[PDB]
Amino acid sequence: VFHAYSARGVRNNYKSAVGPADWVISAVRGFIHG
């Protein structure tokens, strides 16, 4: 399909994974200095 979707919802769901992404990325950069 290519209309029944909702980009405004897909992205809105992405910004979510971004929340924890800070932890994951934080652990990466945090371990780098480890």
Would you kindly provide a written description of the structure presented here, covering whatever features stand out?
- This protein has one helix at residues 7-32.
- The protein is an all-alpha fold and 34 residues long.
- It has one domain.
**Structural class given helices, strands, pairing?**
mainly alpha
Instruction: Please report the distance between the alpha carbons of the first and last residues.
Output: 47 Å
Compute the number of structural domains: 1
Shape annotation: rod-shaped
Largest sheet: none
Please bin the fraction of helical residues. over 70%
Report the order of strands and helices: H
Number of helical segments with 4 or more residues: 1
> Got a strand count?
0
- Strand-residue fraction? under 5%
Radius of gyration: 15 Å
